[PDB]
Every structure is written in C-alpha cells, then in structure tokens.
Amino acid sequence: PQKQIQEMKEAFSMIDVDRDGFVSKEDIKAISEQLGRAPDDKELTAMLKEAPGPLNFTMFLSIFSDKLSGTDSEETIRNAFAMFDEQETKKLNIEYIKDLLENMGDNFNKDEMRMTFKEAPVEGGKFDYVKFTAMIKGSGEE
Amino acid sequence: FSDPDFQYLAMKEQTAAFDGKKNCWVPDEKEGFASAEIQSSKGDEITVKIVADSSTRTVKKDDIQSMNPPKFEKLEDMANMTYLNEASVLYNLRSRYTSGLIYTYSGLFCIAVNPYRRLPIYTDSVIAKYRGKRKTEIPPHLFSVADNAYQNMVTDRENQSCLITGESGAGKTENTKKVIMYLAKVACAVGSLEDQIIQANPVLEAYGNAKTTRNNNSSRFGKFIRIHFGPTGKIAGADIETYLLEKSRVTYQQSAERNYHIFYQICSNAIPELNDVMLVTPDSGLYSFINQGCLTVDNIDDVEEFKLCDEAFDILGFTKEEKQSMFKCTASILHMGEMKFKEQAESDGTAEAEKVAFLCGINAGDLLKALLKPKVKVMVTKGQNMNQVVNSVGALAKSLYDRMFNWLVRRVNKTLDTKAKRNYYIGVLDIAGFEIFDFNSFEQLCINYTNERLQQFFNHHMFILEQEEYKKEGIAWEDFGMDLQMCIDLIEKPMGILSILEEECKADDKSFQDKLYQNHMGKNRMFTKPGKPTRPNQGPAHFELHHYAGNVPYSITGWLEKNKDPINENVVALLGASKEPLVAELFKAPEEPAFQTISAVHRESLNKLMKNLYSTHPHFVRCIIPNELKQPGLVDAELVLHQLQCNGVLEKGFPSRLIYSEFKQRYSILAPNAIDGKTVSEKILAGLQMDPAEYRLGTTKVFFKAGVLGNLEEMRDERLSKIISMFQAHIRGYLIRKAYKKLQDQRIGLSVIQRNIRKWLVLRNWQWWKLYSKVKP
Amino acid sequence: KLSQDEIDDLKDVFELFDFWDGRDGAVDAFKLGDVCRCLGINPRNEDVFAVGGTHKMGEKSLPFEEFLPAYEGLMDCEQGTFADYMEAFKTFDREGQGFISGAELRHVLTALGERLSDEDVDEIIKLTDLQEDLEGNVKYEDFVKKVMAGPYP
Numbered sequence A: 001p002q003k004q005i006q007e008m009k010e011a012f013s014m015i016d017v018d019r020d021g022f023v024s025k026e027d028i029k030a031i032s033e034q035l036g037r038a039p040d041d042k043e044l045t046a047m048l049k050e051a052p053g054p055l056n057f058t059m060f061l062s063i064f065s066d067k068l069s070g071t072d073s074e075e076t077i078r079n080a081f082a083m084f085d086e087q088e089t090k091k092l093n094i095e096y097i098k099d100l101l102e103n104m105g106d107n108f109n110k111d112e113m114r115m116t117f118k119e120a121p122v123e124g125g126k127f128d129y130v131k132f133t134a135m136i137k138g139s140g141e142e
Numbered sequence B: 001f002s003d004p005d006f007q008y009l010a011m012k013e014q015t016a017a018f019d020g021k022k023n024c025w026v027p028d029e030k031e032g033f034a035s036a037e038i039q040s041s042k043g044d045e046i047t048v049k050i051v052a053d054s055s056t057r058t059v060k061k062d063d064i065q066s067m068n069p070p071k072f073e074k075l076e077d078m079a080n081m082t083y084l085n086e087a088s089v090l091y092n093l094r095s096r097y098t099s100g101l102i103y104t105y106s107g108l109f110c111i112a113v114n115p116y117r118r119l120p121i122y123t124d125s126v127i128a129k130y131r132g133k134r135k136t137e138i139p140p141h142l143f144s145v146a147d148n149a150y151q152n153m154v155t156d157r158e159n160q161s162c163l164i165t166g167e168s169g170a171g172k173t174e175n176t177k178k179v180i181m182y183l184a185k186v187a188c189a190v191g192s193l194e195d196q197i198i199q200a201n202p203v204l205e206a207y208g209n210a211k212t213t214r215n216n217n218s219s220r221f222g223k224f225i226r227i228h229f230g231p232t233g234k235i236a237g238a239d240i241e242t243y244l245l246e247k248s249r250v251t252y253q254q255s256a257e258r259n260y261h262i263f264y265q266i267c268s269n270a271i272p273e274l275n276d277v278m279l280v281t282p283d284s285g286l287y288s289f290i291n292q293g294c295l296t297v298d299n300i301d302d303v304e305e306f307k308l309c310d311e312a313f314d315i316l317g318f319t320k321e322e323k324q325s326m327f328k329c330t331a332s333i334l335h336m337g338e339m340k341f342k343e344q345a346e347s348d349g350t351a352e353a354e355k356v357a358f359l360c361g362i363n364a365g366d367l368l369k370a371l372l373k374p375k376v377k378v379m380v381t382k383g384q385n386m387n388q389v390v391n392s393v394g395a396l397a398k399s400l401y402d403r404m405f406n407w408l409v410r411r412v413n414k415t416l417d418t419k420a421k422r423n424y425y426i427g428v429l430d431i432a433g434f435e436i437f438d439f440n441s442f443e444q445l446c447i448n449y450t451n452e453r454l455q456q457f458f459n460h461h462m463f464i465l466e467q468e469e470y471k472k473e474g475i476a477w478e479d480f481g482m483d484l485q486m487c488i489d490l491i492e493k494p495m496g497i498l499s500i501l502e503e504e505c506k507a508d509d510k511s512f513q514d515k516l517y518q519n520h521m522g523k524n525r526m527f528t529k530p531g532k533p534t535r536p537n538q539g540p541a542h543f544e545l546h547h548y549a550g551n552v553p554y555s556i557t558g559w560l561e562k563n564k565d566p567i568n569e570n571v572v573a574l575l576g577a578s579k580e581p582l583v584a585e586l587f588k589a590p591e592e593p594a595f596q597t598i599s600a601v602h603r604e605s606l607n608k609l610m611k612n613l614y615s616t617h618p619h620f621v622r623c624i625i626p627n628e629l630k631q632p633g634l635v636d637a638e639l640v641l642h643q644l645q646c647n648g649v650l651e652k653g654f655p656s657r658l659i660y661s662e663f664k665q666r667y668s669i670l671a672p673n674a675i676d677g678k679t680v681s682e683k684i685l686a687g688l689q690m691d692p693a694e695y696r697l698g699t700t701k702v703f704f705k706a707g708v709l710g711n712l713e714e715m716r717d718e719r720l721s722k723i724i725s726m727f728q729a730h731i732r733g734y735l736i737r738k739a740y741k742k743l744q745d746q747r748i749g750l751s752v753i754q755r756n757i758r759k760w761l762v763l764r765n766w767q768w769w770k771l772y773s774k775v776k777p
Numbered sequence C: 001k002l003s004q005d006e007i008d009d010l011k012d013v014f015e016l017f018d019f020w021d022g023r024d025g026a027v028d029a030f031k032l033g034d035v036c037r038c039l040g041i042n043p044r045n046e047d048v049f050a051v052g053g054t055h056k057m058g059e060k061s062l063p064f065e066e067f068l069p070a071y072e073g074l075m076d077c078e079q080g081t082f083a084d085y086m087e088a089f090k091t092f093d094r095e096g097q098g099f100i101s102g103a104e105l106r107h108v109l110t111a112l113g114e115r116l117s118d119e120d121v122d123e124i125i126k127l128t129d130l131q132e133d134l135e136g137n138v139k140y141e142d143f144v145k146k147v148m149a150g151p152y153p
C-alpha cells in the first residue's frame, strides 16, 4: 500500500547492488553474505524461477504481494481469539489456548506449536493474544 | 340420665388448636409414639418438631403416622374413627385408661386394659342402670356387653358365646367371673342356686390357680362354663368343662413361684381342729413339694381365703364327709413329698411314709413293699430302683392331683345340674392364649394348637363381618389364610404329629423323631427345621413351626412318656382297691379289666368345644396388660402394642380396602392422563391393563387381592425413578442446546486462528521473507 | 426411521464435533449422547449407554455410519410429557398447594434418579431465571414449563 510498497521500495536499493535496477543471482548472494548468511546456489536460482519474468521492482513487488493475500484482517484475529476470553481479560491461560491448538481442531503439531510459542508473549500464565496478533502480522507502534 | 355414680364409668375442651397435615404421630422409643408438629421435607427424611419435649429429629415419611382431631378423643367406640392405626389406637386407650375408664369398643371387639386396683363400677345400682340398654347409650362396660348377649339370646333365639381373651395377668379370669356375677342379678323369686354357682370359683380357684412370676393368680386349666336357661327368666342350670391343668406344678415350683393356693392354705391354722385330721403341722415352710419358691403371696391371706374355701365348699352342698375327704387326699401329697430312701430299699423314715396309709386307707407298709421295687402283671415283679422310685412317687403325686381335680369339677357339675327345661346357653370361655417362651415343648404346644383352632372361629366371623360391606359398598367379589388350616391340619391331620405321638408310640426319642422330618418335613412351608433368632435367656429345641402369632421352636425329648403318667400299676392296683371312697373311686378298674394318652381326650375335649362355639352367636372381649409392674394407672407402650399386633389391628389374608380420595394422592402417577372427579382412577386402573377379577370398584372405596396394592407400591416406586430421571434428561438436553450457538461461533474463530498462524509460519520460512527481514533497518 | 434431510440434520452437527476432537472423521462415544441432545432430544445416560455410548472421555470413537444406528435407536426412546413432570412432583407437595422448597428441589434431582451435578442445577436455574419467596419455596409447576419449553423460546 503506502509506506508498504515505498518501504518495499527503499528496500530494492538494498538488494540490488550493481544498482542496475535488477536483482541477479550474482546480484543476491552478495548482499546475502553482507548481512549474515547467504543461500545455496540452486536456492538462489530456485528464487529466480519464482520471478517468471526477470528482475525488477514490479516483478518483485508482485511475487511478494502474492502472499499476504488469503489471510484475514487483524481485528478479525484480535477478535477470533476474544471468543475464548469470555470475561474480557485480554489474555488466555497458556495451557488453555495451547490445549486448543493440539488436541482439538485442525490438529497443530508439536513442531508447529514449538515454533509457534517459541517467542509468544506469555506472562504469569497469561498468553496475550492482543499483541500475539498485533504482531502475528505487524503491529502499529511508533 | 347422667352423672350420679358415673365417676369412673364414662365436658372438657373443644378447642386448643389442632391443625391438619402439620400435626401427626412420630415413633418415640420410650413412649412408643410421641406427638409432633412438622417443620420441613427433604425426600424420605422429614424435619419435625416434638410437641411437649420441643426438640426435633430426622424421620422416614413411612414411619410417620396419621393422627385424629380433638372432639374425636377418648372415644367410646374406635370403630367410628378416621385413623384406626397403631399410634392412634395406643392413644385413645391410654387417654381413657389414665382417666379412669378401662372399657372401650373397637368394632365388635371389647377393650378392658387391666386396672390393678379395685373399682366401684360393679354395684347393683349400675347393673340396674344397664340391663335392656341398647349399646349406644350407656358408657362402655362389660355389663352393657354381658347384657346384649341375652338381649340377643331371647329374641334371636339361639345360643351365644363369650370369648374373653388377652395375655397372662390380663384379666381374662377376673372378668369371666364379674360376668357370671352380673347375669346373676337378674333372677330371684316371689344359698340361692345363683349364690351356689358363684362359689364354684373359690373351689376350683383354690385347687386350680397359682401364683406366677407374672400374675399371683394365673389359671392352669382351660375353663368353659356353660350357663343355660329356662324358656323364661333366669337360669335353668349351667355346667363346667375344664381344659389341661398343669400337672407339672404339684411337685415343682419355678423359683419365685408356688404350688396351688390350697396346699399353702392348708397349713395356715384357720380351723386347727383339722390340723389333726390332716396329720399336718401348719407351717408352709419346710414341706417340700410346695415351697421351691415364695411361700407368701403379698396382699393374699391364706387363712381368710381358706376359711372362705371351707365356707363355700359347704354351700356347694358338699357333705361334712365329702368336705373332709378332699383335704385329706390333698394333704397326703404334702407327706409323700417326703418318703426318703437311702440302695433300692432304704426307706429311711418309714415314719412319714407310715402316714400315707391312714389317709388312703391302705396299709402304708403294704404299699412301700409292693412298689418300693415290688411288682406288676402280664403278674411278675422287678426291682424298682432309688430314682424312678423318686420319679415314680410324683408319678403318684400328680397322677392323682389330676384325678382329684377332675373329680372335683365333675362333682360341681353335679350340684349345678338341676334338670329343669333347658333351651338356650351363654357359654363363657376363659382359656389360655398363645405363649412363646425361651423354651417350648409339648405342654406348651397344645395351648397353641387349641388357639389356632380358635383363630379359625375368629376369622370365620370376620369373613362374615367382611361381607358386611359387600353389602355396605355395593360389590360382589368372587385361602386368605389357607395355610392356617395347613397348620391346623399339619398338626391334627392323620399323618401328623398327633396322629403319631398317638400312633408311633419299641418307642424311644428318635424312633419318633425320624418319621416327622421324613414325612411332612424337609418339604413343608410351615413344618420346617430350626435355626437361631437368638431367643435371649433362651434355649434347646428340635423342630420349629408357624402359627397365626409367629413361629416357635419345639423339642421332642421324652414325650411318648410325657403324654402319659407312670402310675406304677400295682401301686395303683393297691390304691385301686382301698377303703377311702374318693381314692378307691379315683382309681377304679374299668367298665372291666381282664383309653387315654393326653390327646385322645384333648383332641376330643377340644373338638367338642368348637362344635358348640359354632352353635353360638359369639362376642369377643379383649384384655390388655397395661404393664409389667402390677401397678394401676401405669402404661407400658412397648407391651400394649405387642398385644394389639395380633388381635384387632395389622402385622389376615383379606382385600385391601381403599378410598378414592386416597388412591388419587397415591398411585395417580401410574397413569398420567386426566384433566376432582372421584373417578379420577377408573382410568388409572384401565390405564394399566389390569386383569380385574383381581379388583372391585365399590363406591367410596376399592378392594384388591393380596400383593396387588403391594405391586402398586413396587411399581409406583420403579415408576418415579424414571419419571424423574426423564425430567432430568430433559434439563440435560436443554443445556447442550442452551449453548450450541456459542460453540459453533468458536469453531469458526479457531479455524481463523490455527489457519493464519499456520501461515505466519510459512511466510517466515520463505527464502525471500528472510532476506527482506534480513534488512528492514 | 428418519428422512434424508434428517440424515443431514446429523451430518451438519457432527461436523462440529468431529471438529472438537480433531478433524479426523470420528468422534468419541462419550460425546455421542451429547450430539443427540442438540438435535432436540433428551435421552437418558443409561440409554446412550445402550446405543454404544461411553462413560469417560476418550475410550472409543466412531465415524458417521456407526454413529448412525445410534440416533435412530436412541430416537425410538421414551421421553416425558408435562403430566409425568407434575404427577411426580406432587409426591413432594404436602400442602398440596403446589410448592417445593429450593433446598429440597436441589436434592430431588441432585439426589434422586440420574443425579445431577450441583453445577448443572445452578446454571439451569440461572437460565430459567428461577426464584423463591421469603418463605423460600418455589412454584415448580412453572419451572417444569420453562425447562420443557426449551432454551430460546
């Protein structure tokens, strides 16, 4: 949307070093080992085939925008939880919600949960969904 | 016509507030049933407040008992009651007893709870105030009853009978008398055959009665005096047939108990002239056959009564000789209870033993010879030994006291027998009753056998008053205690005990015990083997059995002899022919020489009894033993009730009468389709699919066979568990739905949750997302 | 037997249960009777225990084709009529007035029949918005009409 694509934009400078305005294989793996670890060769290529067409900000912005699609809004999540906090505490019992996701429903799996709560905001037993949401996708904060 | 001599014969409050279903009877443990005013409910448990104790307790609603209102208290006739139940019956009486009335009626049943003191209720004045009085006017008195039996003998023209019963020391014997004493005051002309009959008691009561741990004057013989009449007036005559005297007493006196009154009154020195006719030192004390227990009966004078006995004995028209000829026989036992031994011979003091001789008119020496170990016929002789000898002495003691008692009575019947025109009779029975002790054998069985027979005549007259509301409440109905005759029969029927103790009697104990079990035992509901119900101070038996009073464990030890008396033949033969009339007669050779086992006569005696009872329009009297203490005014709840348990209230096989007004609040639940309308049930009935010979719809009530009304409760029980659990299942469902919406919403919400998340966990594993994030500085 | 649009009134609500056990195509006999309630019914626990059914949670689970003969069997099951629910609450009315104190009522269903947990009883009252007088007695006659006359009227 706004900063969102402009943010995504200011980011393209970054990725592209030759600053040719296009992001090649020999154009990624570089800035890769420039901010940490780089991928694998094939990975690189396997990342370019995902760019049906060659490499620019709009073929880019494309495949990217091609994901945050089939996902609900935020208040519709910061509320989907709320259905289990009957008394409006703005928090759930860490053994409650957790009980939920693995025993009943679309059966999450350990690997899935572990990776789910590995950083979840639990206080004295209370899982704060308000922000696990406010962040599952990106809180407004500044 | 009120209140002159009616001080203890027959107002107060109308009101002090009685409520309806707030007040009722509750089971107390000291008072039997204590009064209470209810407080709350909780299922079976019911909270109620005790009236004049004032402190509350838990109670099952099936022990709680209905109670009647005030102006219905201290009632003359309990038949006219709303709640003739246990805690109601036990009340009314108490109320009346504690108030100076002893007599009460309940349907065709008389109620006199024994007052241990004397009472003014018997004055001719009163008597007068009675005769001819219809039942419903004059307050309740044996008189009123005694009267209407004649009122009824005449006009209806048939014999009536009057059965007076209750427990021991109840009052049977004391009213039976007061009764003949009444009938008496209606005949005289214009010491008296009337006054002669009155005396027949002091005689038979002297020889016959005795002091019992229970009652100092317990009978020991069954009496049934018949009192005939002329076509018109007072009596024509009377007669007496007695039943089963206790022979046992004569020689043994249960501790704290004594032998027959006479014996003791023979040694009191009233007429000392006789001391010498008796060869007896007038000290009760160290004679033996009569002093195992008390020798003194308090508030009972041996001289005065004895004199009264002698005095009476005369008016009986007994010669001076006959008069004496009795005392004589009677004293002879005092002495024989003495005849020492030391051996098969040792007759230590043949100095007393000397003495029996002068009295019977048999040389004592001849007698001590001929049967110390002397012989019999076939005649032969074989060594009588030191013990049976002792146990053959009493053989003679008792074997006579019976022949003597027998005679006495048989003789009284003789002077009371004027042979004038006789038409009707008022037979009065003063017999035993049912007794269950910590040991019951044979003697103690016939009292029972005789009663069972007495129950047939009892309900025989109930089936009959029963069909008195098959007429009252328009209904025709088409065993109900058909095992009862299966007891009667079990005992008296031909292949039974009787038909055998009489038959199978090479006889010793089990020869006899075997047939019994093998034949109608093993396999009979009634005649069964024993077990331990823990009789308390209780003991030894061999067989058990059921009577319309419950069961009782019998023994069979030495009966084949128990049904007989071992009067050692020659002792008899020798006594047989002696010079003392009474004695010689009391032992006569037969119609001719060259019969009796105790039942051949009793079954005979009894059968005869019944026959006549059925020849009479009976009248029942009920005697209640207020308490165990011989104290007047005292009430022993636990006992009164025990008594009411088998006579006029519940515990036999008849139809369960029930008013509709009740059938409603009762089983209405077994058929839930209706809307008052007194017909609220005809429907429930059909609405159940019942085979109806099984029931009859009279007017304001309903009659079912047995176990009918029983199953209704058993169904009504199983029926409401369901009906409740049903309405429970309802509530249960209303819950699972009260919240379904709620559930389905969440089902959505979760789908949202474990979906977005399951993606926000793919976004961070997408090669590119990493790199982007690698750089948002 | 039941209709086809009915064989659906069963597919629809069981797809909520296969849910809260985990989408697998099976449910737990324990929850069985519960589903059958949601479908306008009130079987007895003894009942559901006949038609398969299970005591404690997680014992045995079943798919649709077995979970089917259930409903139907437990369908031809005895239910109660208004009278029954009154011709039975009369045996607790001594005044005959038509009242049964709360202290009692509790006990009645908490202690008799298929006893109810105090909990249920507490809610079921909250819901039906019951109440007692200063005498503490309740007019049961009604109460039986509320519970009978379902959740949302």
Ligand SMILES: Nc1ncnc2c1ncn2[C@@H]1O[C@H](COP(=O)(O)OP(=O)(O)NP(=O)(O)O)[C@@H](O)[C@H]1O
Binding pocket: B114, B115, B116, B117, B118, B119, B166, B167, B168, B169, B170, B171, B172, B173, B174, B175, B212, B215, B216, B217, B218, B219, B220, B432, B623
């Ligand atoms: N109405 C009465 N008034 C005064 N005393 C009475 C009355 N009824 C009975 N008694 C007394 O209670 C005693 C018991 O009477 P009794 O005739 O011995 O009883 P029973 O029922 O005939 N028992 P039993 O003869 O041993 O089978 C009497 O001897 C009197 O002491």
Ligand SMILES: [Ca+2]
Binding pocket: C017, C018, C019, C020, C021, C022, C023, C024, C025, C026, C027
């Ligand atoms: Ca499932």
Ligand SMILES: [Mg+2]
Binding pocket: A016, A017, A018, A019, A020, A021, A022, A023, A024, A027
């Ligand atoms: Mg470039």
Ligand SMILES: [Mg+2]
Binding pocket: B172, B173, B174, B217, B218, B219
């Ligand atoms: Mg007597």
